[PDB]
RNA sequence: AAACUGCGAAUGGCUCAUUAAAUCAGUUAUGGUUCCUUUGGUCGCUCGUACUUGGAUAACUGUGGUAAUUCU
RNA sequence: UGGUGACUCUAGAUAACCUCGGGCCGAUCGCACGCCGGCGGCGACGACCCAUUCGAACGUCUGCCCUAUCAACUUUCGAUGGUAGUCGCCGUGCCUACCAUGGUGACCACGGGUGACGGGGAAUCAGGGUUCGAUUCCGGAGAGGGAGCCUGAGAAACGGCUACCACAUCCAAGGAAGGCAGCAGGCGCGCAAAUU
RNA sequence: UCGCUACUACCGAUUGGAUGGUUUAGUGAGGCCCUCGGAUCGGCCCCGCCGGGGUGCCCUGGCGGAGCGCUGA
C-alpha cells in the first residue's frame, strides 16, 4: 500500500473478540492508543458485545456520546478507543465497574468490580530513561510516562497507579515468589508464582511459573505481568482463578453442574 | 474590437466598441499595465490617460503580465498565477495564454482610467 | 530523477535481475550541490516526514575548534589546498567533508594573546601597536600577576603552527556534511595528521 | 607510516591525538591510547586488539559495528581480497519424499579484522551479524579456531 | 446557502500482466531509520501597540471574451 | 545519574555555532459565571521535542517448477573488496575519485522457458504420493505502454499533473478534452460467465 | 521393384512489404537542480501645497511628482 490502513476486515480480527462469521465483512478496526491493536478490546465491543448494552453500532455512538463512559477516569469519545489490559470502565449513570483482565481461555471477560478498586490500576515498567536535566521517567505499557519514579523501580517491575492524579503509590518488584500473570501467548489469562527465570543474552529470557495446583508452565518474560507480592493479589480475579482446567474436567465440572437443576 | 473601460473612483464599468484603426494606433506594441494618453478615441477623451490592464485575444485566451510575446503561448501554470485555479493542491495545468503586446489580435481590452 | 536502489545492480553470482517494480519515491536520489567559497547561499529542501536539509551553494565562514586549547572561534575560509578523494575538487574549490582548507588565524591569535599574554606570530622586528600593548603589558594586581606567569610556563605551541600564525592562515580540516547541514565546521590541524597532511600538500605539486 | 598507506589519514575516531603534554610527556613516551570494547557474548577480545596499529572502522573490538543477531559458523576458502575472506556453509536438506537428506553448501563473505592474523583456510570460524558493511558482507569473524591438522 | 480555512481523498474496490532467490512463508534485526494521528510527558526552565499589530483576497456587486471546458 | 549481552547509549561539564529558502518559547475560539482594578473554572484548536500506537522501509537464516540441443559467467559502461566523500530517512558500489583483482560455478552457477503472482489452502488418497491453487484472508504488483514530477505524515498516485509512443472524442479548423484490470451496461473475443 | 486424387512442412526467386526485442552511432520532449535574467508589485526616502501638538526645528493627516536613489517580493 502507499500509506497506513484504516479497514480491518472481521476474519482477519483477534479471535478473542469472538466475533461471528456472518455479520459483516469488516470488524470495528481500533483506533490508535495505549494498546496494540492485537491487544485490545474495543469499546464497541464491550457495549455491543460483551454487556448487550447497545444493539448496533449507532447506540454504541448514542451511548458514548452522551458521556456516559469513562476508561481510566477520562471520558472517551470514541467507540473503537482499544481499552486493554488492566484499564478500568466507570459507567456512573448505572453505578457499574469493570476491570479488563485476562480470564483461563485467552479472551478477556465482564469482571464487575467494585468502586472502591476502581480509583487505582497496576501497569508494568517498560522502559527507564534518563534526560532533560538528569530527571527520570517510567514508560508503562499504556504510554504513561511517570517522571520522578522511586529509584528502586526498574524494567519488568509492577508499579501501582492512582488514577485521579497519575502518581505512583507502592509497587512490587520482579523477583521469584511473586504472584504472576500471563498476558500473551498460549498459557494466556493464567496464574500463578514465580518459579525460576532463565536468562539467554541476546534473545528471550523464559520465566518458569508454578499454578496454585501444581501446573508449571513457561513464557517468555514479555509476557509476564507481576500481579501480587508473595501470593496476594492486589487486584481482584475473575470468577475462575487463573488456572486452566484440562477439558476433562472442564466437561466434568458441566455435567455435575447440571445435577443442582430442579 | 472593444473597450472595458472602468472608473475606479466612481466604480463604474462600460464596455465601449470602437471598429477603427486610427483610434486604435496609439495602442498596438504596448505592454500591459502602461500609461498610455487616451486622446485618439474621440472628442470627449481630451485630458484622459488611461492604463492597459488587460485583455483577451480572438479566440478567448486572456493575456499575462510577463510574457513577451506578440501571439499565443503554452505556460505550465501553478497556484499564485493568473488564468488558473486549482482544484487540487499541487495540481498544475499547462494552459495557453496570450502574451502582453497588444495586437490587432484582441477582442477586448480592458482599461482603467487613472486620470 | 537518481535512483539509490539496489535492484538496478547485479547478483553477487553476476546474473542481472528482472526488476520486480518501477522507482519508488522513497528510492530517490537529489543531485550533488557542490558548496564553494563565497558569500553565505542556502537553499533547504524538503525531505521524508517534512523535515528539513539545508543544502548549501555558498560558504564563507564557519567554527572550527583548535583542539589542544579547547577554543572555538569563527574564521573565515580561504582555500582549498588538498582533498583525498578527487583532486579536480581542489581546483574546483568545492567544501565536502573531510576537505583541508586553509582559515583565518586571527580569532585564535586573539584568544592567545588574551589568555596567555604572549605574542603569537608577530615579526622578530616586532612592530607593536599600543591597542594590543595594552593586552601585552597590561598592570597586572597582586594575585593576578602570579596567575599569567603560571599560565605562561606550559604555553607552547609545536612549531609547524606558528610557520602558519607566521602569514596567517592556518590548516583546518572539515568535520561536517556542508551539503546537509548548510554548515562547514570541522577542527585545526595539529600534531601529527598536520604533518602527514603537510608532505601530501609538497608531494603533490 | 606502518599505517598511513591510504590517501587520507587513518586515525581511530574517538580517541584525541594531539594533547599538549609537559616536559615529563614528552620526554617519558609516545603514548597512543587505543580504543577497544566488549562484545557482549562472551568472546574474548584479543590481545592484538588492545596492543594492534591496526585501524578499521569494521572491526569488532575497535571499530563501529554492534553484533546483533544470529551468531553463526563456517570454514574458511578464500582469502584473497583487502581485510575479508569466504567461508562456507555446509547443512544437509531433508528430501520429505524419499526420506533422506542430501548435501547443501552456502557462502558468505565475511569481514575478517586484522587481529586475527595468521589464518590460513580449512578452519572453522564464528561469524556474528551486523549491519551492512558492503554489497555482500553481513557478518563479522568473532573467534577463529583452528582446524586440527594443526598442531 | 455561498466562499475562504482545516481534514480526507495514499484507504476501500478491481485484476494477475510482469516477476524464479525475485515475490512470499516461517525466523530474527534496526544498538542503521522515518512515522499524520491517538495516548502520556513537556510547554512562565532563555536575564534580553500588548486592554491586541500589518497588508492582501474570495463569496458579493458590476463590466466582458471564446463555437467550445469544473476556461476565466 | 541510569542502562544493556554489548554504545561512539542516556544524562553531566566546557568552548563556540545556530541556516533571512529562519527552530520552539500561543496576537486563536466556546460555555457557565464570578471572588476580593486585579485573581479565576471547565473545554475546543494549536505546538518544537520525547515516548507510545498504527505502520512503513532496509536487512539475517532456510526453502520453489521444467530445461545441459544452456558449462562456464561477471569485469571498458561496478563485477567482488578497501579508503575518502557525494547523495539519501538512515546501513551499504547507492554513486564518484584512487586503489586491490577479485566474486559465482556439477552441492547444476549463468542463460532460456513456464498454459508461474507467492502463501493460508483445494481435489484425490490404505500407507507413501500426485495434481491444482486467476478467485472473496494475508503479502506483492499494476491502472493502455514506458518515463518525470507536484502536494503531502504517507504516492513516483493515474476516479492527480507533464511529456513521448499507441488509440480516440468534439471543432466554427483557431483549439479543447481523454484512460471501466470500480459498479452496472456495450462491442469484440471466444467452448466459456448475471441487472445500465 | 514399378501407375491416380489431396494435405503438412521446408527450401523457395521476389535484395516483396509491415512490426517487435537486443545493442553501434547520432539526436533528445518534458520535469527537476544550478547559474543568470528581471516583465511587474510594494516599502523607505526628497521636495511642493499645506493643519495640529511640542518648541527657526521634530512627529503626525491628505495627496502630487521625480530620481540609473536603495532595498524587499
Redesign the pocket.
Same mark, same amino acid.
Given at each position: 500500500?502507499?500509506?497506513?490502513?484504516?479497514?480491518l476486515?472481521r476474519?482477519?480480527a483477534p479471535k478473542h473478540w469472538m466475533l461471528d462469521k456472518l455479520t459483516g465483512?469488516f470488524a470495528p478496526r481500533p483506533?490508535?492508543?495505549?494498546?496494540?491493536?492485537?491487544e485490545c478490546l474495543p469499546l464497541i465491543i464491550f457495549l455491543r458485545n460483551r454487556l448487550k448494552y447497545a444493539l448496533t453500532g449507532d447506540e454504541v455512538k448514542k451511548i458514548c456520546m452522551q458521556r456516559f463512559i469513562k476508561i481510566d477516569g477520562?471520558v472517551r469519545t470514541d467507540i473503537t478507543?482499544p481499552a486493554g489490559f488492566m484499564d478500568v470502565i466507570s459507567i456512573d449513570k448505572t453505578g457499574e465497574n469493570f476491570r479488563l483482565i485476562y480470564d483461563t481461555k485467552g479472551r478477556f471477560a465482564v469482571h464487575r468490580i467494585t468502586p472502591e478498586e476502581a480509583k487505582y490500576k497496576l501497569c508494568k515498567v517498560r522502559?527507564?530513561?534518563?534526560?532533560?536535566?538528569?530527571i527520570?521517567?517510567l514508560?508503562t505499557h499504556?504510554?504513561?510516562?511517570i517522571?520522578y519514579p522511586d529509584?528502586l523501580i526498574?524494567?519488568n517491575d509492577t508499579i501501582q497507579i492512582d488514577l485521579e492524579t497519575?502518581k505512583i503509590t507502592d509497587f512490587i518488584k520482579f523477583d521469584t515468589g511473586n504472584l504472576c500473570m500471563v498476558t500473551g501467548g498460549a498459557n494466556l489469562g493464567r496464574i500463578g508464582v514465580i518459579t525460576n527465570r532463565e536468562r539467554h543474552?541476546?534473545?528471550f529470557d523464559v520465566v518458569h511459573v508454578k499454578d496454585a495446583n501444581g501446573n508449571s508452565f513457561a513464557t517468555r518474560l514479555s509476557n509476564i505481568f507481576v500481579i501480587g507480592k508473595g501470593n496476594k493479589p492486589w487486584i481482584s480475579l475473575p470468577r475462575g482463578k487463573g488456572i486452566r482446567l484440562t477439558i476433562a474436567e472442564e466437561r466434568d465440572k458441566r455435567l455435575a453442574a447440571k445435577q443442582s437443576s430442579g | 474590437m472593444?473597450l472595458?473601460i472602468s472608473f475606479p473612483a466612481t466604480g463604474?464599468?462600460?464596455?465601449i466598441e470602437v471598429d477603427d484603426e486610427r483610434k486604435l494606433r496609439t495602442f498596438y506594441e504596448k505592454?500591459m499595465?502602461?500609461e498610455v494618453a487616451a486622446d485618439a478615441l474621440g472628442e470627449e477623451w481630451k485630458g484622459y490617460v488611461v492604463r492597459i490592464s488587460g485583455g483577451?485575444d480572438?479566440?478567448?485566451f486572456?493575456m499575462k503580465?510577463?510574457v513577451?510575446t506578440h501571439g499565443?503561448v503554452?505556460l505550465?501554470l501553478?497556484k499564485g498565477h493568473?488564468?488558473?485555479?486549482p482544484?487540487?493542491?499541487?495540481?498544475?495545468?499547462?494552459?495557453?495564454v496570450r502574451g502582453?503586446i497588444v495586437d490587432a489580435n484582441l477582442?477586448?481590452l480592458n482599461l482603467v482610467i487613472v486620470k | 530523477?537518481?535512483?539509490?536502489?539496489?535492484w538496478?545492480?547485479?547478483?553477487?553470482?553476476?546474473?542481472?535481475?528482472?526488476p520486480?517494480?518501477?522507482?519508488?519515491?522513497?528510492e530517490?536520489?537529489?543531485?550533488?550541490?557542490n558548496t564553494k567559497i563565497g558569500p553565505?547561499?542556502?537553499?533547504?529542501?524538503?525531505?521524508?516526514?517534512?523535515?528539513?536539509?539545508?543544502?548549501?551553494?555558498?560558504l564563507d565562514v564557519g567554527?572550527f575548534?583548535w583542539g589542544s586549547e579547547?577554543?572555538?572561534?569563527?574564521t573565515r575560509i580561504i582555500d582549498v589546498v588538498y582533498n583525498?578523494?578527487?583532486?579536480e575538487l581542489v581546483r574546483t574549490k568545492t567544501l565536502?567533508?573531510?576537505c583541508i582548507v586553509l582559515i583565518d588565524s586571527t580569532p585564535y591569535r586573539q584568544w592567545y594573546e588574551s589568555h596567555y599574554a604572549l605574542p603569537l606570530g608577530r615579526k622578530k622586528g616586532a612592530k607593536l601597536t599600543p591597542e594590543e600593548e595594552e593586552i601585552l603589558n597590561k598592570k597586572r594586581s597582586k594575585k593576578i600577576q602570579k596567575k599569567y606567569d603560571e599560565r605562561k610556563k606550559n604555553a607552547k605551541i609545536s612549531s609547524l603552527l606558528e610557520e602558519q600564525f607566521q602569514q596567517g592562515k592556518l590548516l583546518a580540516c572539515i568535520a561536517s556534511?556542508?551539503?546537509?547541514?548548510?554548515?562547514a565546521?570541522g577542527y585545526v590541524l595539529e600534531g601529527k595528521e598536520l604533518e602527514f597532511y603537510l608532505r601530501k600538500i609538497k608531494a603533490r605539486k | 607510516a606502518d599505517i598511513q598507506t591510504?590517501?587520507?589519514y587513518?586515525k581511530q575516531? !574517538?580517541i584525541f591525538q594531539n594533547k599538549k603534554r609537559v616536559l615529563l610527556g614528552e620526554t617519558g613516551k609516545e603514548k597512543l591510547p587505543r580504543?577497544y570494547?566488549?562484545?557482549?557474548?562472551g568472546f574474548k577480545t584479543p590481545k592484538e586488539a588492545i596492543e594492534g596499529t591496526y585501524i578499521?572502522?569494521?572491526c569488532p573490538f575497535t571499530?563501529?559495528?554492534?553484533?546483533?543477531?544470529?551468531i553463526?559458523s563456517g570454514v574458511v576458502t578464500?582469502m584473497?581480497?583487502?581485510? !575479508?575472506i569466504?567461508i562456507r556453509?555446509?547443512?544437509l536438506?531433508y528430501i520429505?519424499?524419499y526420506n533422506r537428506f542430501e548435501?547443501?553448501?552456502?557462502?558468505?563473505?565475511v569481514?575478517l579484522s586484522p587481529c586475527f592474523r595468521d589464518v590460513q583456510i580449512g578452519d572453522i570460524v564464528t561469524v556474528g551479524?551486523?549491519?551492512?558493511?558492503?554489497? !555482500?558482507?553481513?557478518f563479522n569473524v568473532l573467534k577463529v579456531t583452528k582446524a586440527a591438522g594443526t598442531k
Open positions: 500500500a502507499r500509506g497506513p490502513k484504516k479497514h476486515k476474519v482477519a465483512v483506533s490508535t492508543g495505549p494498546h496494540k491493536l492485537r477520562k478507543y522502559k527507564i530513561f534518563v534526560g532533560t536535566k538528569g527520570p521517567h514508560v499504556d504510554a504513561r510516562t517522571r529509584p526498574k524494567v497519575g543474552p541476546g534473545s | 472593444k472595458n463604474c464599468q462600460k464596455l505592454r499595465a502602461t483577451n480572438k479566440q478567448g486572456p503580465q510577463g513577451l499565443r503554452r505550465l501553478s493568473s488564468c488558473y485555479r482544484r487540487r493542491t499541487g495540481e498544475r495545468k499547462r494552459k495557453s502582453c477582442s477586448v | 530523477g537518481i535512483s539509490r536502489d539496489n538496478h545492480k547485479r547478483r553477487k553470482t553476476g546474473g542481472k535481475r528482472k520486480y517494480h518501477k522507482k519508488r519515491k522513497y530517490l536520489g537529489r543531485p550533488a550541490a553565505r547561499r542556502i537553499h533547504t529542501v524538503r525531505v521524508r516526514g517534512g523535515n528539513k536539509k539545508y543544502r548549501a551553494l555558498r567554527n575548534s579547547c577554543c572555538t572561534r569563527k583525498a578523494s578527487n583532486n565536502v567533508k573531510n556534511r556542508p551539503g546537509q547541514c548548510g554548515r565546521d | 591510504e590517501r587520507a587513518q575516531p !574517538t580504543y570494547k566488549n562484545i557482549g557474548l578499521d572502522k569494521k571499530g563501529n559495528v554492534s553484533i546483533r543477531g544470529r553463526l578464500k584473497k581480497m583487502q581485510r !575479508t569466504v556453509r555446509d547443512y536438506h520429505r519424499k548435501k547443501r553448501h552456502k557462502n558468505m563473505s569481514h551479524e551486523c549491519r551492512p558493511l558492503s554489497k !555482500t558482507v553481513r
